Each structure stands twice: as C-alpha cells, then as structure tokens.
RNA sequence: ACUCUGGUUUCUCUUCAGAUCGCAUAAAUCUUUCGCCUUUUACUAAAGAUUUCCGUGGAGAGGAACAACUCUGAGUCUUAACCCAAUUUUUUGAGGCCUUGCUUUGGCAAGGCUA
RNA sequence: AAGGUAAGUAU
C-alpha cells in the first residue's frame, strides 16, 4: 500500500467518485467486483453475494444499502497506468438520499448506475437532478446487462434498442436539468459503461476494442471504439463501416461486434457447458481447469467473464477521461460550495489544491466506532495536509467572521484511509483526498469545516448540505424507564450525528421528536438508537407528518399591533402568494442577495408585479429561502422611509420568527405574502429596540395570518410502483383507500412490468408499501419521496367539528382534527383564539 | 417419451440410478453426482407438479 | 513440441468438526414460566442448559480392487518456404579537422570548420 | 399403563 500512499501526493492521479443510482442496481456489487479485482484474498462466495461495503448488520439483514461506504483503491486503466480512486458507495433507496448528498459534496464526478432490465427509475432521475445541480460530472454505467440475455431473452438488436433508449432518456433528463451542451452522455464519447456486476462484466467501447486489439492485433482500439455504436453498419466486403446497411439483415456495429459475442458467450455456458463450451473457450483463448469446469452455471459465468474481460478498465477510463481530478475540479467545487467563493484569497488558494498550504478540510459524514462511543469525521481535504497529533480549528455550521464562537480547537488523533471493512492508518493526508479523522467528534454535528488553529482568520465555512428531500415524517420517542432519559438524549445526539438529514427537536411539552424521510429511514434510525448508542428500551409513538399553514384569502381586517411602551404601531395584512412563487423562492431561483433592480424586473416580467410593489420586498420566508414574502407597502408620503428603516432588521427578524412558528400550530408558515400598510416608528432609539419591535412584529404577523382565511398544508408523497400488468388494479385499489390518485400508469419499454406514478398523502402513506406488496403477493414494489405540500381539506378553525377518539374523520373534518391533535401533542392550548 | 425424455429414459425408475456410471457418480458409495444440463432440464420438466 | 511428475474406486480404523456437520429434523433429562391439576407413568407450550439417537464433513492410518493406465503442473513450452525497416540494437547517410580551457603527461571539457 | 391383589387352610 506504499504505492497507494505515494499516489495520494499527486492530485492529478486521484479520482473522487460517487456511485449513485436507484435501489438495488448493482452499485455495491460493482464495488465488490473492484475489491475482488484489487484484493486477491477476498473472493465472492459461489451462491451468497459478497457485500463488502455493506458493513452494517442492518444493511446485511435488510439487504438494502443504508449508509455511504467510502472505498479507496488503486485501479489501473486500459493503458496500465494505475490511479487512486476514492469511491463512495451511496445507498440507492430514496429514503436515504441524505447519504448521497453527503457523498456528492466531497466528490468531483458521478457514476450513475442503471439497471438494464429496468428503465430510468425514480431515484435515478432524482440523483441525476441532484448531481447536475451540484455541478458534478455525470457518467452512466448501465449495469445488469446479463438480465437482457439470461432473463429477458431479448434478441441482440432489441438489447441494443433498450440500451439506446436508456441512454436517450438519461440524455433528455440531463438536458432538461442542465444547460451545458457538453453534458451529452454516449458510449462513443466514453461516458457510458455497460456492465454486469453479478457476472463481473464491465466494458466500454474502448476496452472491448482493446480486447480485439490484444487478440487480433493491428487495430487502433481508440479509433475502433468510435465505430462500435450507433447506426454505423459494418460492410464485410469493403471492411469499412458505413451509416447505411450493406445488406437487408445487416446488424449494427455494436450488435455485430459486442452484443453478438456477449450473447454467444453467455449462451454457450448456461446451456452448452457440457458440449461445445471447451471449444468456445479455446476460441476465446480462455483456459479453465478441470475443477473449474465443474462449477455451477452462475459461478462459471462469473469465472468465464473474469477471464475474458479481465480487469475493470472501461470504468476507469470513464472516470479518468470524464471525471475531473481534484486539481481540475477544485474551482467549480469552491465556486459552488464555499461561502466566500473563489474570489477570496483562500478561494484562490483552494483552486490550487496544494498539498502544502492552508489546511481546510470539509467533512460531510460521521462514522461511529464499534462501541458507538466515538465518531470519526469523514471528508475531503481541499487544501493543505492534515497530520496526526496536529491541533486544528474545527469550524461549525453557524460560524461566521463576526461571532467565531461555533468553532473549537481540537487535536487530530489517528488518521485513516477508509476502505469499507479495513482502514489504512496514515500519518498525513495531502489535499484532494478523503480521510477518516478522530479526536474531532465533539464539535462536529452534521457538516463541518476544519482549518489550522492559528494563522487563518479569513477562513469561512462551506455551505451546509442542501438535501434533495425534506424530512416530514415525525415520531415521538420516550424511554420505558423515565430515569434513563439522559441515555436516550445521548442516543438522540448520536443518531443526529450519524444521520445527515435527521432532525431531533424537543417540543414545548417535553416530547422528543425525530424527523425522517420514510418508514425505512425511521425504522433504521430507531433500530440504531435502541441497539447501539442509548442501549436502553425506548417507546415510539405512532408516526405523524409535519404540517404547514397557509392562507387562501386576503385578510379582511387591517391587523395592528403595538409595543409594550405603545410608542410603535405596525399595521400588516396577509394574502396568499402567486402560484409557483413559493416553489421558485425555495428552489433558490431568486435570492435575498439579488439587487433590487433585477428582483423587481423578475417579479414584473414573470409575475406581473407592479414596479413600486416589486422593489419594496424586504425579506423572504422564515429563512433565506423560506416560502414567504414580506413587502413594505407603506406609502412614502405617509411614513418616513429612513425612520422606518431604523427598525427594518428587528421587524424582519420578528417576521421570520412568526413564519417559523405559526399561529395555528408550532409549524412553518408557507405561501403567505405579508404587506406592511402603516408603521408608526418612534424616533428615540431606546424605545425602538429589538426586544420591543420583534415581539410586536411576531404578534402582528400572527394577527394578519389568523384574520386571513387559514388552511393546513400537508406533505404529499410521489410514488413510483413497479408492478406487472395484472397488479395495476390492486395498486389502484390500495391507493384509493389512502386518498391517493394516480397520475400515470405507463408500461416500461423493454420489460413486461408497468410503472404507476401516483400522489399519496404522507400521513396516509404509513404501511403503504407493506399493503401494496401484500395485496400483490410481493409483485408490486414502491418507493415514496416527498414532492409537494397540499392544503388539507376542511376548515381548521371550524369549532363546530366534533372529533371522535379512535375513528378516522371524514374529509371536511380532516383539517380540524389535524390541528387539534397537533396542538395536543405539541403541548399548546386546546384551540387558538383569533384574538391572540 | 423416447424423444424428449432420452437424457433420463434409460436409467430412470431404477434403484439408485447411474450407480455404476462413473461419469455421473463418484462410485458405488453413491455420494456425489455430476449431471449434464439436458438431464437436469428433463428432470426439471418431469417434476413440475 | 520436448522431460519429469504417479492416480481412482472400495472396505475398515483413529481423531477433529468451525460450517444450514443435516438446504433435513427426533427423543430424553434438568431448571424456570405456564396449561391440566388428583397421585405415578404419560403430558400441555414457551424459554434456557444438557444427553442420547438417525445421519455428515475434513484429516490421519491400515487393507482391497483396475494396477497399471493416463493426467495436471513444472522444466524453457526447441523448426525451414517467399516477403522488411527513420524512434532503442546485422544494411542505417553519426565522418574528420581545429580552437581554447584543463589533466603531472596521456586525455577530458566546450566551441568552430564541414561535404 | 396403573393408583381395582382379601389374608388363608386343604386337595
């Protein structure tokens, strides 16, 4: 591993790769193939699939990737030049997109794994969008190509058609999400791998042409690879490739030279091992011992393909020619993630990726020890070299240039290079690499930034992870023994550390809350919290989603509020926002950092907003990208702007607090526009302090929201179901009972399975997958992800509604029951009087 | 049927079939068996019920 | 295409068994919880710990049969017709002279002169 | 399967 250590010092020979894709698409099996390539003593069992990255017992028992597992290996390319690959094996389940997001931050490129039998599934599209928006290089690896042969039994022309359709759909998705023309993915460009991780098949056009060149000779494999795809027919008469088929039954070059040999190889083993297999192996130059020809059909296929295809070089060619090195990709990484940007002195220094310089390591994942007591931060070294025993300054997530309180000085303990089951204990790690850091557990929660303890004051932090999904499922947790509450709290902070998207909060009633993305996510969280960490019995409440509050009409009364000294009066109203405006604000289409001219132009052009009103916007939402707008509609002729602006920060903060904690429940306020009509401001600066304006602003926000007709908004899941033709009716029946409506049921091209797309409420989605699989005998599998917020039917404030104890309420009674029970669980009053 | 059941027809319905065929068994101890794919397919078709 | 390598089957024996000993699955005993309770012998059904039984694998040893038949691996895995060179050696135009520095002298170092 | 033997003396 000395060559591995020396390879770390050369940032040009390093690849930071994230393996991403839908659930059970072969990513883990592909990493197992790579490890088997690099580790001779690690061999997959004949029947049991080796799962080298799946080190968690939950992952082994569930058979589903849960947490990302880093792998650092030395992988030779086609030309025999060894590289240093930092590979992240991100889980493919849609509920665990937080691990994918954490992996994408410390990575420069993306290898997208797609099942050959399946099309482009939900998580495939979601991760394509995330990787494009994270400004990463995208490379496709169409896996499980053996399915098209041994399972679908398609003709080679139809296998080519299926692969081409997959590539076309991926290209369309990338074009829709991105704008760059050079993001077209095609095996001719070297962006696409065809692989079968079960049988150790992995090749591009370049590598397979290299196989030809090594066998036949006198062939330019680089030039021959440019002909092995598309409608480029081969003419045996002229020995040249033409775009026109020379004969009626002429096949494509890809089919004739790649798919036909693959079909024949996979057909002379599964059916003709007894006779004509040794002849075929001799024709291919493959020699197998007597005891190796006695293996079963599947191990025999794996061995034959390992002999014929050898090492994995097409994948390495893809990741070297298209995924930029840390030095090359540092500048877009700093431009996107770093708060200061590339313009800052450090931002310029980061783009150099010098192993000697200002240490700035960004960690996005935290891996726990065997006992669970200690956590090891894991992240990329973006500048400088970290050392064992070296003190460091560990910036937090609220750290800024002003406060400098979120940071903390810590001593770096042992350092490791993590490869799944074993770690290489190192003494130093240069820039552009991935390192396991110990002795840094305590100050790090979620993401963090590590810098030198002294000498670097310009150092800001990196932007925290922007997860692709919102954690809306909420479960309450209490210990069986109330005397063991501190142990449960320690377990809660541990699971918060170990889960990027987890949110543990305490309600005003003392109820501990865990926020999750789905049933499997929270099941894994609870299993961890019980078995590891806390090591105590814990009671779990019934899962309940988190709601949001909006207004469907403008407030009919000019609500007013006054400070305790009565020297300041604010008049405000609340009205619903325009359709699609809240989504644009949340999606960072428009930012608070924009100058007022461009903001006004955007609001006037794309939303027909008046110039006077558009240029008067004060703040956005509860947070910087919150889906609420505060508009200063005060007439300048009535109230002095300079006097009004003296308390602008305080009223903005009060607005943000009020939109964070709604009147109806302690829930976020969404899709509400607030207009300041009259604002009497005191002249003396003692009477217009923050402690007076902020509560008054919150009270006036509450009054404006309540007078306007309020409604509860609930999260809706988007569900993609893989079911056969006969199981679609059962899917319809199951979705009907849970307020779910189907938006699309389209057959999968190249497969007999259908895909039903539907929207289901997140509160009716509990047990939805279990019901779907039980009612369809396991033939219908579904994945649910949060899509949008929808208004709960009924009137939340209707006091005439009667709620039965243990009976589901009708549609008009849904909002009232939701609000009452949410208030009861939160510990607030029975109902909200409009007066307050 | 002599046509489709040919891989198994000769030694089927015999006590310890292929016991003396050293190609398909280790020996008279009757411990291991190595069967060709046609025989396995014929047996699989004969046992669909 | 060269030379050495030297089995398979079967019957016993002695030990070690992680591993689904076994892709199958019994019984007994003991200690706890029950269910029947009225005393044995039977039991009810869960947990825990044992023992026996029906079988199994590896290795070792000793007989027998086909003992004579060949393997695999290693060893260097050992040959001529007609056709050929601007990136590493049988076709490759790479020669000589001089200057000055310098070496105890021989020579070396750089430059110049070519044809 | 038992907790269902009369204890005898004669032949």
Coordinates of N, CA and C in Angstrom, one line a residue, chain A residues 719 721 730-742 756-760 768 772:
Chain A
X719 N -45.1 8.5 -5.6 CA -44.9 7.1 -5.5 C -44.7 6.5 -6.9
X721 N -44.3 2.8 -8.7 CA -44.6 1.4 -8.4 C -44.2 0.5 -9.6
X730 N -54.8 -3.8 -8.4 CA -54.6 -3.9 -7.0 C -53.9 -2.6 -6.5
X731 N -53.0 -2.0 -7.3 CA -52.4 -0.7 -6.9 C -53.4 0.4 -6.9
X732 N -54.3 0.4 -7.8 CA -55.4 1.3 -7.8 C -56.3 1.2 -6.6
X733 N -56.6 -0.1 -6.2 CA -57.4 -0.3 -5.0 C -56.8 0.1 -3.8
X734 N -55.5 -0.2 -3.6 CA -54.7 0.2 -2.4 C -54.6 1.8 -2.3
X735 N -54.3 2.4 -3.4 CA -54.2 3.9 -3.4 C -55.5 4.6 -3.1
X736 N -56.7 3.9 -3.5 CA -58.0 4.6 -3.3 C -58.2 4.7 -1.8
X737 N -57.9 3.7 -1.0 CA -58.2 3.8 0.5 C -57.3 4.8 1.2
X738 N -56.3 5.4 0.6 CA -55.4 6.2 1.3 C -55.3 7.6 0.6
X739 N -56.4 8.1 0.0 CA -56.5 9.4 -0.5 C -55.5 9.6 -1.6
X740 N -55.1 8.6 -2.3 CA -54.1 8.7 -3.4 C -54.7 8.5 -4.8
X741 N -54.3 9.4 -5.7 CA -54.8 9.4 -7.0 C -53.6 9.2 -8.0
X742 N -53.8 8.4 -9.1 CA -52.8 8.0 -10.0 C -52.7 9.0 -11.1
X756 N -46.5 2.7 -12.3 CA -47.6 3.5 -11.9 C -47.1 4.7 -11.0
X757 N -47.4 5.9 -11.5 CA -47.0 7.1 -10.7 C -48.2 7.7 -10.1
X758 N -48.2 8.0 -8.8 CA -49.3 8.5 -8.1 C -48.8 9.4 -6.9
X759 N -49.8 10.2 -6.5 CA -49.5 11.1 -5.3 C -50.4 10.6 -4.2
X760 N -49.7 10.4 -3.0 CA -50.4 10.0 -1.8 C -50.0 10.9 -0.7
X768 N -48.0 1.9 3.5 CA -48.5 1.8 2.1 C -47.7 0.8 1.3
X772 N -49.2 -2.6 -0.3 CA -49.0 -2.8 -1.8 C -48.4 -4.1 -2.1

